[PDB]
Amino acid sequence: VQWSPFVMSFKKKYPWIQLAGHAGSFKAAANGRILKKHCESEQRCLDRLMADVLRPFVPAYHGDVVKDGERYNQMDDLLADFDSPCVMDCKMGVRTYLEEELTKARKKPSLRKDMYQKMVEVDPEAPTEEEKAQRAVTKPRYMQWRETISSTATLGFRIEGIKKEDGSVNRDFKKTKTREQVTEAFREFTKGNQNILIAYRDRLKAIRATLEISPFFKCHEVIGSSLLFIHDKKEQAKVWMIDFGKTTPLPEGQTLQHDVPWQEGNREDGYLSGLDNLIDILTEMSQ
Amino acid sequence: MVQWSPFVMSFKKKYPWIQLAGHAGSFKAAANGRILKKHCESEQRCLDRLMADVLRPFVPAYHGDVVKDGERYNQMDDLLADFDSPCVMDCKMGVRTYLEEELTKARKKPSLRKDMYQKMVEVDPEAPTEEEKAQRAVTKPRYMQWRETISSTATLGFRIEGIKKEDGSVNRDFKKTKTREQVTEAFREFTKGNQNILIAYRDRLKAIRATLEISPFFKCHEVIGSSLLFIHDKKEQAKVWMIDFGKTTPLPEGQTLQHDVPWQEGNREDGYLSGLDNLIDILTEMSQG
Ligand SMILES: Nc1ncnc2c1ncn2[C@@H]1O[C@H](COP(=O)(O)OP(=O)(O)OP(=O)(O)O)[C@@H](O)[C@H]1O
Ligand SMILES: Nc1ncnc2c1ncn2[C@@H]1O[C@H](COP(=O)(O)OP(=O)(O)OP(=O)(O)O)[C@@H](O)[C@H]1O
Ligand SMILES: [Mg+2]
Ligand SMILES: [Mg+2]
Ligand SMILES: [Mg+2]
Ligand SMILES: [Mg+2]
C-alpha cells in the first residue's frame, strides 16, 4: 500500500421486492442470495441452465438448502446491484398451464360453479348457451378461457406486476390485453426514459438471439416463466429469465419451435411469439 | 409498504480505507463504519470538548477510547463510510504547523543542527545565510520557521498534505506547492473541474466558517496541526470535515484568540480563519470559471 492500511467492511440493507407468488415463497439469504421454496422441476431447470448458453440471462443458481424445516432453492438476488430499483414481471408464453395439466383436468371433468361465476364476472357473454343454462363450467374450457382475458393468447405474454418509482405496486393487469394498454404500462414504468427503453430493447434482443442457439431451450415446454425487468435512477436496465416451476423437458431427442401456434398435443408454448412482440413494442416506444 | 417487500436484504459494503498523512499503525479498522486512531491525550481532550460544542457536526463523531492488543485508541467515525469510490484531499490548516510551546522550547537549548542545515540546503540551496553555509548548521528556531515557508502555509494559511484521485493515484509531494495558482491547479485536477462538486465544497466551507465564528471551543484553542478533509465521489456527494487534534491545545482560562489575524511570537495566533477564507476565495473563483 502506498495509501491503504486496511480494508473496511459494514452491512447495508435494502427491501427485497416480491411481485408475483405467495406469502412465504421467498426468504433472504447472505451474499446477495435468496431462497425460493424448493420445487423439483425448478431445480432441474436451474441445474441444466447453469451449464447452458442462456446462463448469463438467468439468476445464478447455487443448489437446494434446508432452512427452518423446509426445502429451498438458493439463487442470486437480481436486485443486488441496483439502487432503489423499479421492477416489472412479465409472464411468458401464449399459455400459462402445462399440457399435462390440461390432460389431467380433461380426465375427470367435474363441472365448476365458481369458475362460471368468475368467468361471467369478467365477461357475461363469455359462456356458451349450454354453459349459461348450467351456471357452471369446465376446468378444461376455463383454463383455456382465462388465457384470453389478457394479452397472453394474442401477444404471448402478460404483465404480472409493476413496482414503480413512487414506491407503489400495481398487480391488477387481469384485463390488460391490447398493445395500447401494454405500451401504456411500459411507458409509465419507464417514465418514457429512452435510454432505459433502448437498453431493455437491446437486452431482449440478446436473450432472443441466445434462445435460438440454446440446447436447453429447444427441448423444454417453458410454461409459467417470466421476464423480470429491473432498472434504477442510474439508467442501469436488465432483463432475466426467472421462475421455472412449470418448465419441463420434452422426451428424448424431441424438440419445440416456440414461435408456432399451440395445438393441444404439440406442447408448443409460444415463448418466442411472446418475446417477439415484446421486442416490437419496445422498438416502437424506443423510436 | 408491506404491499411489496416480504423481507429486508443486506449486503457487505467493502472498501479500502484511505490514509493520506500520518504514520503506519496510527489507524485500525473498526466495525459499523468506525475507525480507531492511536491514542493521544490532547486529541481525546479535544474530541470530548468538540462532542459538546456547536462544531460537533463538522468533525468525526467521537465514541471514546479503547485498548486493543497492547495499545490505546480513540474510536471515531470513518468519514469515508457513505461515499462510493471516494476521492480525498487533506489540507493542513494554519500559518504554522508547530505550537508556540514547541518554539519556546526550541529557543531554549538553541544549538546548531547539521541535519537541519542539510535538509534546508537540499530543499533550497539559496535559503541559508552565509554564516549558516560556512557553519554547515542551522538552529531550530530558524529551521522550524523556514520550513513553513516552502509551501503555502506561511502565506495562504493552509497546505495540501495529500490527494487520492478518481484515478486511484495518490499524491503527497506538495512540499513546494506554494502559490494560489499551484493550489487552484491541484483542486482543479482533484475535482476534474466539476462545478457541482466545487460549489458544495465551497458552501460546506462557508457553513464551517459560520460555526467557528460562534464556537466557544474554537475561540479558546490554539488550533495547530488539524486538517480540513475533503471527500467527494462520482455521485457528486461532497463534504469537508475538521480532523486531527493531536496538537490543538486550550489557551489559559478566560483567554481568547481571533484566528483571522497574523501570528507574532507570544500571540499564539494560528491564522486558521485566514487559511479558511483563502480556501473559500479559491473555491469561489474556481466555481465561477
Ligand atoms: N432471483 C430473483 N431476483 C430478484 N427478484 C426475484 C427473483 N426471483 C423472483 N423474484 C421476484 O419474486 C417474484 C416471484 O417470482 P416467481 O414468479 O419465481 O415466484 P413463483 O412462486 O414461481 O410465483 P408464480 O409461480 O405464480 O410465478 C417475482 O415476481 C419477482 O418480483
Ligand atoms: N475520521 C476519519 N475519516 C476518514 N479519514 C480519516 C479520518 N481521520 C483521519 N483520516 C485520514 O487519515 C489521515 C491522517 O489523519 P490524521 O491527520 O488525523 O493523522 P495524524 O497521526 O494526526 O497525522 P499528522 O499528525 O501527521 O497530521 C488523513 O490524511 C485522512 O486521510
Ligand atoms: Mg413467474
Ligand atoms: Mg412459478
Ligand atoms: Mg493531520
Ligand atoms: Mg496530528
Swiss-Prot record, chain A:
It comes from Rattus norvegicus. The chain holds residues 643 to 929 of 934 of the full protein. Disulfide bonds: none annotated. Substrate binds at residues 91, 112, 139-146, 246. Catalyzes the phosphorylation of 1D-myo-inositol 1,4,5-trisphosphate (InsP3) into 1D-myo-inositol 1,3,4,5-tetrakisphosphate and participates to the regulation of calcium homeostasis. ATP binds at residues 25, 36, 76-78, 89, 163, 243. Belongs to the inositol phosphokinase (IPK) family. This is Inositol-trisphosphate 3-kinase B. Interacts with DMTN. It is found in: Cytoplasm, Cytoskeleton; Cytoplasm; Endoplasmic reticulum. Residues 114-122 are annotated as: Calmodulin-binding.
